[PDB]
Design a protein around this ligand. Sequence first.
Ligand SMILES: Cc1cc2nc3c(=O)[nH]c(=O)nc-3n(C[C@H](O)[C@H](O)[C@H](O)COP(=O)(O)OP(=O)(O)OC[C@H]3O[C@@H](n4cnc5c(N)ncnc54)[C@H](O)[C@@H]3O)c2cc1C
Ligand SMILES: Cc1cc2nc3c(=O)[nH]c(=O)nc-3n(C[C@H](O)[C@H](O)[C@H](O)COP(=O)(O)OP(=O)(O)OC[C@H]3O[C@@H](n4cnc5c(N)ncnc54)[C@H](O)[C@@H]3O)c2cc1C
Lengths: 153, 153
Amino acid sequence: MDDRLFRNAMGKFATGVTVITTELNGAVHGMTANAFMSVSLNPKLVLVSIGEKAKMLEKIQQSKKYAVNILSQDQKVLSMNFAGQLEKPVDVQFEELGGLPVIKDALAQISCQVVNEVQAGDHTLFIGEVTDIKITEQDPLLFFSGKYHQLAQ
Amino acid sequence: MDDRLFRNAMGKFATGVTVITTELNGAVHGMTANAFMSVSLNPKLVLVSIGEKAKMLEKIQQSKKYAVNILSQDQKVLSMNFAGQLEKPVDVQFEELGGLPVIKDALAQISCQVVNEVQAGDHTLFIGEVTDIKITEQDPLLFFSGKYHQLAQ
Ligand SMILES: Cc1cc2nc3c(=O)[nH]c(=O)nc-3n(C[C@H](O)[C@H](O)[C@H](O)COP(=O)(O)OP(=O)(O)OC[C@H]3O[C@@H](n4cnc5c(N)ncnc54)[C@H](O)[C@@H]3O)c2cc1C
Ligand SMILES: Cc1cc2nc3c(=O)[nH]c(=O)nc-3n(C[C@H](O)[C@H](O)[C@H](O)COP(=O)(O)OP(=O)(O)OC[C@H]3O[C@@H](n4cnc5c(N)ncnc54)[C@H](O)[C@@H]3O)c2cc1C
């Protein structure tokens, strides 16, 4: 079994789409991620998985904090932006939550403090304790089988 | 910030739906989970998150293996079954992959050997190296905001 078969399989697990944001000495950094998960209720924990070659990795290692911005159906362009897939950057509207930069109009905003780091092969798991949450009732951007998708209404 | 607000926020992250299966001395055990994630390409790693009160936790601890069965759109009843939501268990059709019981007609089947265990609050993360994969081109069962859903076609 090859890399292609593995990736194809992994893409059969449908997800939402997030942008992970953090702040390092004034500068806001973001990265598109769907490797995100709810972890624990007591205490309130979440986890994101970041590739070893992602610039975001060292950013979070330093800041020890991140926010997860769950993207609405209307935010596909943001997903592409923070995935490095547009030739031209976009001017993103940021607001603030729990001392973290968050994306305006996100489906949901979840601010976290890093409480654990676990290397796992290719990637590092950043376990975050949630300090602040903001929610809206928007429909979600989905990702499945290598494509963007929507919920059936 | 309540428990309710946290759970509501977590539900804002849409996912596919899996059944985690394992075998322990003849007996097949299954558990519905959406806290699943692709972790690493080299080596090929995956992760599932199991609640400390789940019977499945000790099952995996002992067998040191699990399969992830991604559920198709037609398998909502299976999801409810393995979530302890049916009064009487249905008779599930199992087949075999990499020495693990897997669910027939699943959207995808991914067999794993446990290579790490990480407690994280409420839950334990079982990191699994993938040995075998089977994929189909079915549409996925989705879970979002506490309800089952489908992709827009
Ligand atoms: C849907 C999908 C899911 C993905 N999931 C994951 C995953 O879970 N884990 C993982 O490691 N990778 C994931 N990726 C890949 C990842 O998003 C890209 O590899 C990303 O470009 C890597 O970011 P970086 O940290 O290396 O920095 P970069 O490659 O530079 O970051 C990407 C982009 O973010 C932009 N950006 C950063 N800050 C700002 C800002 N302040 N204002 C405007 N633009 C800004 C930059 O302009 C850049 O183009 C996913 C990609 C897709 C499309
Ligand atoms: C969509 C959704 C996502 C979920 N995600 C997670 C998650 O990621 N992590 C988590 O810990 N919990 C999750 N749960 C909750 C979890 O599925 C239930 O709490 C589950 O009942 C706990 O299983 P158990 O191991 O404690 O054993 P049980 O409570 O006994 O297992 C559940 C059911 O599986 C059935 N079953 C087991 N083996 C077989 C078999 N061989 N043939 C037929 N039936 C069988 C049993 O009859 C039982 O009814 C989720 C639930 C839902 C609905």
